[model samples]
Target: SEPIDVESHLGSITPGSDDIGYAIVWIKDQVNDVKLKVTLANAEQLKPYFKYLQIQITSGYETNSTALGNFSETKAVISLDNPSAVIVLDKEDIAVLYPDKTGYTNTSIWVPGEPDKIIVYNETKPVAILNFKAFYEAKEGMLFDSLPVIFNFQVLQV
Candidate 1:
């Protein structure tokens, strides 16, 4: 198939190293923090700019349960605090994994006190982006319906 947008590609298939990768989200409705397991997909391809790239993963209003799923106009909005931590992982420090056409579903970035326990409160209409050296600093992200799906991000252009 021909290329669509990055979000469509990331949502539908395995990503290129230049593409924003995928992650698994475990929504913790009981706790104020949401657990996000991010995979850098092909970190080996990003070795050159690791030092200049620090990824800051965040969620938007779309992350709320009400805005998602069946989609009713309910007042349920879950806002996330700034990502707890941000850093760049060397290629060697990351664990690479095999991915299917749908993308790498396992192997986490596991960067200390993580998988990203993003603080949530009860919300934005901001567009997210991934970048690498700002070039790959990670500029975009998405949210999916399933429990073990979507909202993963990686380096893009500054």
Candidate 2:
């Protein structure tokens, strides 16, 4: 845990295999602005190897100074049993459009396998989290944000 190598990789995106694309953000002073970019490089003959790589972003930062208590805002969830991730909104709890054959879920969709080029994106959020403590007197519990994301590609089926 003490490795100076903060460097990390999205790794090779492959479907049929249980690899999840994950990223985390930590806000230090209420409004710690941030931006990040991950690039999958030198690709050609772009195809959908992966149906879509679900991206999940989660945060456990809770401020008990005075606000919403340890209120964790979330849009995605991590399966306790599997690496599978999904977004859970107040609007709905079920997943969308997956076939019964491949056994795809809202969180389990993956690449098809032919992307030959590395297309990376740059992302930034002005205010990543509400570092402001909820309420000290009414200190609740631990609260954070969870994210679930997706990417797409088409490689040869194994």
Candidate 3:
């Protein structure tokens, strides 16, 4: 299959302010399972530039108060066959390298009957890949850019 360009929403969260950014990539769909592989020209730059990362899989048709599932770091992997997955890089990781008070919150925002939000902040030029198979299959709602941002996952997918 041909690779399709996927859009990401990037955002940063500090103690007070929040900023959002965007990145585009090519995604190739996998058969059997509705998985997708995302390839980017600047994968290296984005690899180690996150404070925290998170992935949430939910079946659409729930109320605003319903809770979503949080994916584990062990299950998160950045690979060839398994390219598309939600990965979050939070404050602690970026603090070691950059050592800045500014915090960043990055994640995919999904909303019911709306496009997903890809958010990034704090670091410069961050990249992320997300698998929409579960979201698409469940017909769930997602909001990639919700307020009160915070890092909730790690990007150590093996």
Candidate 4:
């Protein structure tokens, strides 16, 4: 299978009946890092190997009024965790979306559905590669921290 997008949704939390509800999302360097690792089950299929992978973030929330929370500066800070894994994309604007097999477009901000994508790869460390994290200033009612991001992959076949 070609590398597929691992789109993530926000983790669930339940507040007490009387307690004021709140959630925390961070983008600080190395504070709350999301790790992505590949499985060997597909290694046999990647004959020529790969050069890069894509990752995405979504502003997913629950149905409750408070579940959505307040929107703040949401961002996914993408960087390499493994020395064997190298960064592919050069731009800093995480809002840029890689539409389909080729090309990209930019959005003013990080919105739900309109997610961000990043590229990275590691020939040495095929497993546990493309480790990146999201960072943001600690703020009240921010949902970006809760936004579950995805890892988009490229598949090269024999």
Candidate 5:
């Protein structure tokens, strides 16, 4: 469908012994086009004028199917570039496992073959979280349908 070009970058720092202010956020996704990368790290201590950064994305859906299978929309992107330093990005689609509540089929979770571990958060900031997992088991079954996922963010100013 041609619409996945996820790109993110934020690099430029010059504060060392306590100017206090650090950041590095990265998120990328692009299935069928190949390109998946997720990262997170934060620090604060620079305050004399003011500086901030953020990124956000959210999605969640699952009606039935035995249980365990839901992920929709969920998107986020934030960039400050450095005008003093401010960048933030957020994406949410809470829902990790399901085996009841009316969800669960055959037992092949992520399908493909194996390798599937994706855990992301940032609803209101509890600790700035990050977790990523990817694996396609050589495209099992082989039918080639459509798979595209991309999300990216980067911020740094010390």
Candidate 6:
């Protein structure tokens, strides 16, 4: 409960069989290309350095409408082209990380073909990690609304 900075706890990158470990094998379009190897084993003492790592991910395909009584509901119509930026909804619950919380309600986020949608009403939790600005143009809205990052697949849930 005390980690605002300090290098964000040094997340990712652990290569040492020779050095350099960034594995993800695949994931395109939605953007997820992490497969590294650029010669850092030992080039005359190992020189050249600079750190400012930056990573990103997305894609829910704009298709997930849930509404099963008792106020129960789920939505995911995200497909922005970049009309604007600054969206941030990240949930994959590990223990608890509420970052002030934002949107993702009865659910609404369209704009792949076009219709312009953005109405995320929240209740509690589920699937997440939808980013932008803080981080898209179907023309929709709300790029950073992680009122709760809801993402529950079951098995290969990514």
lDDT of 2: 0.24
Please report the TM-score between candidate 5 and the true structure. 0.23
Per residue, candidate 2 scores C-alpha lDDT tens digits across 65-136 of 121122335444222122233322221111122223232221121111212211111211111221111101
TM-score of each: 0.23, 0.23, 0.22, 0.19, 0.23, 0.16
Clashes of each: 18, 47, 33, 8, 33, 26
Candidate 1, RMSD to the unseen true structure: 19.1
Instruction: For candidate 3, report its TM-score.
Output: 0.22
Give the top-scoring candidate (lDDT): 3
Lowest-lDDT window of 10 residues in candidate 2?
130-139
- Residue 27's lDDT within candidate 5 is 28
Across 1-158, the per-residue lDDT of candidate 3 in tens digits comes to 43234464444422212222333332222211223322322333333433323323221211121122122122243322232445333321111111133222332223233344322223333222332221111112423333222222222322
Error of 2 at 7 (Å): 6.8
What's every prediction's RMSD, in angstroms? 19.1, 22.4, 19.4, 19.2, 18.6, 19.1
lDDT (0-100) at residue 31 of candidate 5? Answer: 19
In candidate 2, which residue ranges exceed 4 Å CA deviation? 1-9, 15-17, 32-48, 51-158
lDDT of 1 by residue, 24-73 (tens): 22222222222223343434444432332323332222222322211112
Looking at model 1, report the run of 10 residues with the lowest lDDT sum.
70-79
Report, for every candidate in turn, its global Cα lDDT versus the true structure: 0.26, 0.24, 0.28, 0.24, 0.27, 0.21
lDDT of 5 by residue, 1-158 (tens): 33222322223232211111111122233211212233323222221212433332222333233444444442333223321222223333223333332344322222112124222221111112222222122123333233222333333311
Model 3 backbone overlap count: 33
Worst 10 residues of 3 by lDDT: 131-140
- What does candidate 4's lDDT look like per residue over 1-158, in tens digits? 22223333223212111111112122222222233332222222222222322222222211112211223232233222321222221122111222222222221222222234212111111111122223223233432322222233332221
